[PDB]
Design a protein around this ligand. Structure first.
Ligand SMILES: Nc1ncnc2c1ncn2[C@@H]1O[C@H](COP(=O)(O)OP(=O)(O)O)[C@@H](O)[C@H]1O
Ligand SMILES: Nc1ncnc2c1ncn2[C@@H]1O[C@H](COP(=O)(O)OP(=O)(O)O)[C@@H](O)[C@H]1O
Ligand SMILES: Nc1ncnc2c1ncn2[C@@H]1O[C@H](COP(=O)(O)OP(=O)(O)O)[C@@H](O)[C@H]1O
Ligand code: ALF
Ligand code: ALF
Ligand code: ALF
Ligand SMILES: [Mg+2]
Ligand SMILES: [Mg+2]
Ligand SMILES: [Mg+2]
Ligand SMILES: [Zn+2]
Ligand SMILES: [Zn+2]
Ligand SMILES: [Zn+2]
Lengths: 364, 366, 343, 366, 213, 214
DNA sequence: TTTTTTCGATCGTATGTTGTAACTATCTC
DNA sequence: GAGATAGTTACAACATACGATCG
């Protein structure tokens, strides 16, 4: 069995959380000083620790010793909260329960005093899926909240909530986990699990994670399965190559340096999986246009292309503008002529060959 | 777990236990009934994390101790659909329950009994036994005045107060109030609690009008009721209920007495054409005369006149016909007494010969 | 009807309590603060009952009318709150509000929240009925020019010290979103009990959550700030704005500029501005635009805009944002070699 | 117009006229019924542009001829609310109508009578008369099989076929068929018509078990029913209806006889644990034995076994339990005969005692 | 008589043509005992996503035990082959795209399997689910019961939310080359006792692109 | 009342069609050898006989005598199919039934056995007008239909169908009719109708036809 | 002192209003 | 005390408003 790494390694303490200092420090100071707000909201990308931090805060609020930022983890309340059997902690999957009738019964329990806890904690996750009537009921409940109830909200789309709901809760935004922290966490987990590994494999997995720890753990599990109980550089590289889906940028880089063999290999790899050739041409045209814009002004490239920022910057810095314009025009002509080519693959190959070796002759 | 029972001995307790359950529960386990066989006794339990119902049945046939959880509606339908006088044999095999009756076999899925929530024990503070008739009278008198959905939670329930040798039920919603009180024949310490709507509904349902006394225990934050082999436990709402004594008029100078049925019919006829949106009517009271008028935006008017026992000065007052009709329906008596002071003051409605129940209605701005 | 700003609302409430309060604006923070102040004052005066409703086509006005008409046994002094639609009231809503204003009582305190009303909305029977017994608080988000003063004052009232660099960073990161900025100040105060907020300290706990409108993008294009224009365009794309709105907003100003440039050969600019009804404040920026773009330009821009419109309409293409970025760079003084213009 | 009429003589006709009127007419005139007084009769008419109902009441008090339109709901409620034995005097003044009776006064609004839609006259091709009981039995034998909202517009009604000395009712929805036949005692030309479901429901509500024969007239595209002082007119679907003879199985070779009550109870018990969407069950027939099995997505299985009269080869078939339950409920007989040929052919169901009515159900390939 | 595509569906891991990496990963996972609870299969049409999913279900639910080489002869294997196995719940997401169906399915996930050791939900064409349906599966998919496994197959993976993708192990099947298709056709025709010529098989393989169907 | 030549002269036998020899030979061989697929798609230009061939195949499948490539044309099933009122032949106009709800309702009834014929044939015309959801809903059942149902699809724009749908069915392409074939058919029809004509008029009409007999 | 948008066809979710069927309580013989 | 009638509750169908995707 061995369980799953994502489930097994849930952070059970504030010290186990990776990064997110600007949130944990504020929460600890608030708990120590007694400055506790009525409603908390957590936002961020996938797999950054919103639910983990919410559960840790809920555990800290209702600990036997007292309101502290360092829960003991041994009293009955801590164990029940960890196992998910605590009576005074109500966890609501708003995605599964969206209708007003379902939410009304849950929200009507605020009229009963807590059974065995200082506070009655409601942890509503995926709260952006609620309907308008559910939002109205939640707002009415939050207008006059009893002094012994707290609301914790977690979502990835805070813009979907009404402004009235947002204005009555304190919002914390979580950040990406960065490559170094992800690599360190993976190394620690593998060392605890007694699994052989190499630095290069860990670096590749961390880079492919793209700021999400759950993605990193899933990739690590897949690599362990592929490597037959071991994590090796060759196995991880092969696995990533299998899932690689950025043939457009690689094709652009190969074409710009006039390397026909690499272009043919990339075309074969793209054809190995099911891809739309016109989509590939559109992606290449978009990449060339973005490179031209970046050459015009460095601010053109934004945070949406953070994954391939370095390669785009290098291409913009190295390639002269005239070559970029020539390639863009050649690809435009190729896209225009694609429908009448003998085949889509043949059309793409002919256009890439023309870009590699040939130059059109313009009138006059 | 194995046992054998009769359809008659199981049909009614199962219905009572499974009545509260409905809709989509918060958790799947809450949608099931807990069955426990032990020391020649079958216990059926049903809860929804707010109130609990427990029923017991005696077994006089070979059985094996155990515990499990089964679907409520499915099991009830299966038991009800069998022919009258049949014998039902229930057995547990693996993760399945087998029900046999004659040549009919049914297989049902179950869940572990360890996951079923159980309410923690608490110590009662007041205990008293009263006939079912008194509780039924109090509930039927004071139920209709409770609020439906208000931000002030304490108004959604009913106030039960023990004072001396008297038990009083009060309900209100900010626009109308109903109060009733009955003796119990035993002295109890002064106390007051608030019962939620669902608790009152279940307490009303569990009463069957039999001679078995109803035993009530009230604690810090919970209330338990015993009736025969049925136990009902509920939680209490936290808050402060408004004091009803100040609501009653201090000195109502004007009095009136009217036939209940005639007044009810006149109000119904007036409301037939009253504005549906507002449901407002206007009453003109004069010497031995009461006139009821109503109108709608389409310039259509309805009028009625009747005789009463009145001796004060002429007056006009507006009302919401719904509240008056509800009060009249609540009071089943030959004559009704109305007490009032002016057109901007509350009106008291009571029975001509009975003082146990009283109602207060606030006039509408008209 | 009295007219006020959020700062004077507390003084007016101390002076006295009126029958109706209108809160109109686009800033959630100021509206919430005004509502909280009004409700606190009312509760002090003895208003312990509050009701809230949302104005929409599927609205139950019968409940509101019953609430207004009915009395209370003990809990008197009711407060009613209405939330107008984003678009604004229509004829049906106008007559409903007129009827509601007809049924108004001294013990009922009315509050209305919504966006700023136009002249057509202002000229309504219900609006005029409350003119003699109403006070309107205007809650408009301050522009970038007045934002740093607001940030400094808000930090001052919280007993915090902000450096100039920290203030600039806060203004840049939370422009047009005062709720986020206030929450950021609260989080910074929580993080550092000493209250000393330096640039490195603030830079750690700040994220980009700015809010913009197409008019800001057009103004940035007119001024000629490529970085600001690109940032605004990226924020608008993230929000999910409709490209057609941006296209029309840019088209109006672009056609005006083309006409002014063509007809300014033998006419002073002041006369042209007067004839074209140009607002006095804008006449500055427009002027410099005419000193930065030649007649050879403003034709390539028009061609690119027309091509983008055709692609959006008939081709249903997805590269509208790339063309918008190219046009934004074109309006600023950049080469823009014209291979991308198809000229 | 002015006339005084007893409440009792006017109660039932008002309800009969208001029956066809729907909750949402979409036109103010449609929501109002037409009231006319002429010579010594009072006529109440109600139409919805597809159906028409007319009732007549005798007048013994002085009156003046006239016509008008009044809301059905308000007038009916006002008349019903008055005490028994009261006399209602209705007079017309301008645009208002006084309904003064006793001490109560009402002013109902009115609309011009000329605006009331009317139905064009038609020629009656066939005319006959039958007892109410026969018509009620014919309609009840096949009402349940009518399609509700099938895409085929002609399958939403019932097929009436007059042939020889008999009248036949046919109902179908594409998967089940119900046919009934009853003698009429008079020879009529062969003819077939289709009646919409609303007309059938109105005709059923019209019948009251009285001894007055019911008279039926059928034209090209219209049908009229006369009973007592009540007349009903409806249109025809004028569509293509499948022939029932083709649907009936041909020379079935397997016969089964069973008790209606036991079979119905077994099917009802089996249906509890069947699929909610498809409601599929499996029947196994063997020597003097019938077994019913049902399964649901939760993998809960129900099994029933009973003894029947059968001597053919073993067979397995599938069915929709809802149709079988409906047929068994409709039969209301002591014994039931089922005729089958194979697992892929339809199955016929009839009453052992009489063959007046027959039903056909197709199988499913579970 | 019977269609070749339906008749020649693989019933053992040895019968699968190509897809070596996916089969090796699945076999290693089954042998070591490290079994996830959410698998996603992607690729072009007619490459064997459903076949591999059914083979994995057979391996999980085989009577002999959790093995990478199902026997193919016990009751569970035969029932899975015939599509009559109770514990293999196959959902056609293309038909049931509404959130009500998803809620009904989720309401019965905690019940134990009837006969097998695992309850396997195989959702096909999962890319056609509605947004509410996708968001309703997040928590159950993240932390399912011990005896529940989820298998997902689609040809348009990019339409799924990133949150769904982060919760499952992804396997991308690759299009088959001409040689493998020609060899498979030769084997099938030899088993069927049908005359053929090499050039015809080469033409058929080239005309089929990279799909065996 | 009066019927135009196009409606009157619809072929009712495999020998009455013009051209399309390869499709007819393939269908006849498949029927004779007993190898019958469950999904047929017909593609081609307009007015080439896709619907005619589909109806002929449906008639041949459900003929009382047996599964033959030469329908008798005299039994009840053949006559009912010719008249277009056969219970077990369900013809869907996809151009007006594009809604996914209609497709789901149609698929929910595939479990019911055929009424009279041995197969339940679904003939979907203009299938290229269905929505994406309809195609995706079809996919699963089209892959593995029950043993008592068949699917016949006719389209003029096969490019719009998704590749997944195309992969699940046997495709038959109909060539555009030649000038000589059209001229011969017109001459035969006119001779049967007893109408005077001249060779040059027939030549001009055939040339203006542009490969479409309709 | 303002300046705010392309259209047609199809699919999915949530709420309010009206009508019908089954079961229970009450009324009449 | 049983059958018939009236009243209540639950489920289904129809209509309206709002949000999202692809051509
Ligand atoms: N900051 C973190 N530190 C340690 N582990 C983390 C962190 N964030 C996420 N994880 C890992 O990712 C898994 C899923 O995180 P989750 O609670 O789903 O976050 P979110 O709610 O943002 O999706 C957890 O089991 C946890 O081990
Ligand atoms: N890798 C493979 N090995 C053997 N046969 C295959 C393979 N892939 C596809 N097939 C054949 O194609 C047919 C359809 O495959 P299918 O299960 O529909 O795959 P997908 O789910 O990817 O469409 C199967 O009946 C099978 O015979
Ligand atoms: N192969 C053919 N042989 C004889 N007549 C044909 C042929 N193809 C088309 N026709 C004539 O054209 C008319 C319409 O053909 P139709 O079935 O609509 O073809 P499609 O479905 O391709 O449009 C028919 O009535 C028929 O007379
Ligand atoms: F559970 Al998440 F982002 F996937 F909070
Ligand atoms: F069944 Al497929 F791609 F056609 F998985
Ligand atoms: F061209 Al057609 F049916 F008329 F295919
Ligand atoms: Mg989470
Ligand atoms: Mg598949
Ligand atoms: Mg055709
Ligand atoms: Zn603790
Ligand atoms: Zn096996
Ligand atoms: Zn034939």
């Amino acid at each position: 069995s061995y369980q799953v790494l994502a489930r097994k390694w849930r952070p059970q303490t504030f010290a186990d959380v990776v990064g997110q200092e600007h949130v944990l420090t504020a929460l600890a100071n608030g708990l120590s000083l007694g400055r506790i707000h009525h409603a908390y909201l957590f936002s961020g990308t996938r797999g950054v620790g919103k639910t983990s931090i919410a559960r840790l805060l809920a555990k800290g609020l209702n600990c036997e010793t007292g309101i502290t930022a360092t829960p003991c983890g041994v009293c009955d309340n801590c164990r029940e909260i960890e196992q998910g059997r605590f009576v005074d902690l109500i966890e609501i999957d708003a995605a599964s329960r969206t209708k007003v009738e379902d939410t009304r019964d849950l929200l009507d329990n605020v009229q009963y005093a807590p059974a065995r806890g200082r506070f009655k904690v409601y942890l509503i996750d995926e709260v952006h899926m609620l309907s308008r009537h559910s939002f109205n009921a939640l707002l009415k409940t939050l207008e006059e909240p009893p002094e012994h109830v707290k609301f914790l909200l977690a979502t990835t789309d805070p813009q979907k909530l009404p402004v009235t709901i947002l204005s009555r809760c304190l919002q914390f935004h979580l950040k990406a986990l960065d490559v170094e922290q992800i690599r360190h966490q993976l190394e620690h987990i593998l060392n605890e699990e007694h699994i052989a590994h190499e630095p290069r494999a860990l670096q590749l997995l961390a880079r492919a994670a793209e700021g999400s720890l759950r993605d990193a753990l899933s990739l690590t599990d897949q690599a362990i399965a592929s490597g037959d109980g071991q994590v090796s550089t060759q196995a991880v590289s092969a696995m990533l190559g299998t899932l690689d889906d950025d043939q457009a940028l690689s094709l652009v880089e190969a074409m710009v340096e006039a390397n026909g063999e690499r272009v043919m290999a990339l075309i074969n790899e793209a054809a190995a999986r099911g891809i739309e050739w016109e989509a590939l041409l559109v992606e290449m045209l978009g990449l060339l246009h973005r490179i031209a814009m970046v050459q015009l002004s460095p601010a053109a490239l934004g945070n949406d292309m953070a994954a391939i920022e370095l390669r785009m910057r290098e291409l913009a810095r190295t390639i002269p503008p005239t070559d970029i314009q020539l390639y863009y025009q050649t690809l435009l002509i190729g896209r225009k002529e694609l429908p009448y080519a003998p085949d889509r693959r043949m059309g793409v190959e002919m256009t890439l060959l023309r870009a590699l070796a040939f130059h059109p002759r313009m009138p006059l | 777990m194995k046992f054998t029972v009769e359809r008659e001995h199981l049909l009614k307790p199962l219905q009572q236990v499974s009545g509260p359950l409905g809709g989509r529960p918060t958790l799947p386990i809450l949608g099931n009934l807990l069955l426990q066989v032990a020391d020649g006794t079958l216990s059926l339990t049903g809860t929804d994390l707010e109130m609990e119902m427990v029923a017991r049945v005696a077994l006089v046939q070979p059985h094996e101790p155990g515990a499990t959880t089964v679907p409520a509606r499915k099991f009830f339908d299966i038991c009800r659909g069998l022919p009258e006088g049949a014998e039902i044999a229930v057995q547990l095999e693996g993760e399945r329950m087998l029900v046999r009756s004659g040549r009919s076999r049914f297989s049902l899925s179950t869940l572990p009994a360890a996951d079923f929530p159980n309410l923690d024990d608490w110590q009662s503070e007041v205990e008293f036994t009263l006939p079912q008739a008194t509780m039924k009278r109090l509930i039927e008198a004071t139920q209709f005045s409770m609020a439906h959905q208000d931000v002030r939670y304490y108004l959604n329930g009913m106030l039960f107060e023990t004072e001396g040798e008297e038990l009083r039920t009060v309900a209100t919603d900010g626009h109308r109030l109903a109060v009733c009180s009955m003796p119990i024949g035993q002295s109890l310490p002064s106390h007051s609690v608030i019962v939620p709507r669902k608790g009152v509904i279940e307490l009303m349902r569990m009463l069957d009008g039999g001679d078995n006394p109803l035993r009530v225990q009230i604690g810090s934050n919970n209330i338990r009721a015993h009736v025969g082999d049925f136990i009902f436990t509920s939680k209490l709402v936290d808050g402060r209920f408004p004091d009803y004594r100040r609501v009653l008029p201090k000195n109502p100078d004007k009095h009136l007495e009217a036939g209940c049925d005639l007044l009810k019919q006149a109000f119904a006829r007036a409301a037939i054409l009253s504005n549906e949106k507002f449901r407002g009517v206007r009453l003109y009271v004069s010497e031995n005369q009461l006139k009821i008028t109503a109108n709608n935006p389409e310039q259509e008017e309805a009028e009625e006149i009747l005789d009463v026992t009145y001796s004060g000065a002429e007056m006009e007052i507006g009302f919401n016909v719904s509240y008056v009709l509800d009060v009249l329906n609540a009071l089943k008596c030959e004559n009704v007494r109305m007490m009032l002071t002016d057109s901007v003051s509350s009106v008291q409605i009571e029975d001509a010969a009975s003082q146990s129940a009283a109602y207060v209605v606030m006039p509408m701005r008209l | 009807m009295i007219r006020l700003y959020p700062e004077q609302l507390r003084a007016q409430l101390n002076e006295g309590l009126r029958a109706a309060y209108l809160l109109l604006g686009n800033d959630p923070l100021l509206l919430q603060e005004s509502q909280d102040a009004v409700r606190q004052v009312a509760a002090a005066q003895g208003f312990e009952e509050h009701h809230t409703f949302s104005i929409d086509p599927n609205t139950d006005w019968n409940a509101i009318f019953s609430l207004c008409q009915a009395m209370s046994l003990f809990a008197s002094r009711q407060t009613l709150l209405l939330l107008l639609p984003e678009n604004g009231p229509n004829a049906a809503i106008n007559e409903q509000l007129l009827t509601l204003t007809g049924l108004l009582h001294d013990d009922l305190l009315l509050i209305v929240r919504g966006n700023k009303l136009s002249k057509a909305q202002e000229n309504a029977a219900w609006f005029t009925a409350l003119a003699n017994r109403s006070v309107q608080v205007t809650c408009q988000t301050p522009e970038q020019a007045q934002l740093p003063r607001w940030v400094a004052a808000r930090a001052k009232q919280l007993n915090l010290e902000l450096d100039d660099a920290a203030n600039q960073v806060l203004c840049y990161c939370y422009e047009g979103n005062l709720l986020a900025l206030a929450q950021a100040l609260e989080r910074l105060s929580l993080l550092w009990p000493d209250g000393k907020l330096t640039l490195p300290r603030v830079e750690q706990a700040v994220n980009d959550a700015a809010h913009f409108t197409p008019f800001h993008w057009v103004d940035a294009l007119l001024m000629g700030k490529s970085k600001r224009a690109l940032h605004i365009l990226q924020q608008l794309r993230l929000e999910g704005s409709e490209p057609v709105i941006l296209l029309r907003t840019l088209q109006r100003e672009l056609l005006l500029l083309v006409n002014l440039k063509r007809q300014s050969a033998h006419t002073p600019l002041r006369a042209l501005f007067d004839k074209h009804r140009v607002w006095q404040n804008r006449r500055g920026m427009m002027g410099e635009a005419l000193n930065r773009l030649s007649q050879t330009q403003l034709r390539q821009a028009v061609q690119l805009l027309t091509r983008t419109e055709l692609t959006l309409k008939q081709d249903y293409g997805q590269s509208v944002w790339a063309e918008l970025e190219g046009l934004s760079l074109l309006l600023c003084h950049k080469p823009l070699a014209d291979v991308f213009i198809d000229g």
